[PDB]
Amino acid sequence: HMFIDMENMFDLLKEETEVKDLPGAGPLRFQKGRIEFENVHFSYADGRETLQDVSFTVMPGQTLALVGPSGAGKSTILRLLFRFYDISSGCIRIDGQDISQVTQASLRSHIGVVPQDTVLFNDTIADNIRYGRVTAGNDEVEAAAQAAGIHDAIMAFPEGYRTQVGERGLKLSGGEKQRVAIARTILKAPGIILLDEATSALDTSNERAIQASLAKVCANRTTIVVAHRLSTVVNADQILVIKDGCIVERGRHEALLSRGGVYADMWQLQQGQ
Numbered sequence: 001h002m003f004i005d006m007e008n009m010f011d012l013l014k015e016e017t018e019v020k021d022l023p024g025a026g027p028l029r030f031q032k033g034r035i036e037f038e039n040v041h042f043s044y045a046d047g048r049e050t051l052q053d054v055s056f057t058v059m060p061g062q063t064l065a066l067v068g069p070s071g072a073g074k075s076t077i078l079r080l081l082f083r084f085y086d087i088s089s090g091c092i093r094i095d096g097q098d099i100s101q102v103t104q105a106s107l108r109s110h111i112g113v114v115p116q117d118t119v120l121f122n123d124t125i126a127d128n129i130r131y132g133r134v135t136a137g138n139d140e141v142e143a144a145a146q147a148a149g150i151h152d153a154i155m156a157f158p159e160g161y162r163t164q165v166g167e168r169g170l171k172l173s174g175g176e177k178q179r180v181a182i183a184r185t186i187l188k189a190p191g192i193i194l195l196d197e198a199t200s201a202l203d204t205s206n207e208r209a210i211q212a213s214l215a216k217v218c219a220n221r222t223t224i225v226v227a228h229r230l231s232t233v234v235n236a237d238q239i240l241v242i243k244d245g246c247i248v249e250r251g252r253h254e255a256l257l258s259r260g261g262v263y264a265d266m267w268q269l270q271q272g273q
């Protein structure tokens, strides 16, 4: 270790939490939104492998549900797709293009995220929807709200689209707040949707309403979902069961059941025979 270059050690550490566009990198040429992870290894802090040889394909417009126990790497897969971090080997591609080789601005422009909980800013409801694409006009925000199903609700607000919401203003209902996150995604008109499902739930009516809107927004869009809801897993095109960074099994819900493996155990456990 007398021949180690300390500056190079710091450069390597820096590369662990920094993501740079390549010199001369172009825009992603997004076409249908096919997603591929090919043999992906990834570590957050250089101690230990958070994803181990992770390979899968999401064909354009199909849904992929990631399930498995705590700490498996599910959300990690979404963060890597948004290139929050660089991976350590393997490749992530969208429509065949390595995402580490394009401008990260162009990458993210094609990807809409619905996180677990919706962050509301102390600003008008319109600006809160506009957050999904800040360049967007009031006509676009309003159209997004309408497709999110909260336009009529907003029109009834004490100052309509100008009404201050968040902490300092009018309190949105649970359903409304979740439709704002939807409206943002709608406004983005992204080709890929990453959903990370909340572990809290509203009432049955609200959950069914919210799931119905989400499926409208995700239709014809390649979707990856960190799933908590049984209904979301059952309806997916493909399910990865992930344990400790490895995909231990995969298929559609019915094929995982009839496999009688880990997924089938989980399903039997939830049923409670």
Ligand SMILES: Nc1ncnc2c1ncn2[C@@H]1O[C@H](COP(=O)(O)OP(=O)(O)OP(=O)(O)O)[C@@H](O)[C@H]1O
Residues within 6 Å of the ligand: 044, 045, 050, 069, 070, 071, 072, 073, 074, 075, 076, 077, 226
């Ligand atoms: N930024 C980080 N730095 C270091 N470790 C992290 C970081 N983010 C997540 N981890 C750890 O990496 C592992 C994978 O986390 P990930 O968020 O992918 O979990 P998950 O499969 O979505 O399940 P969970 O519901 O437990 O979050 C977890 O043990 C997590 O605590």
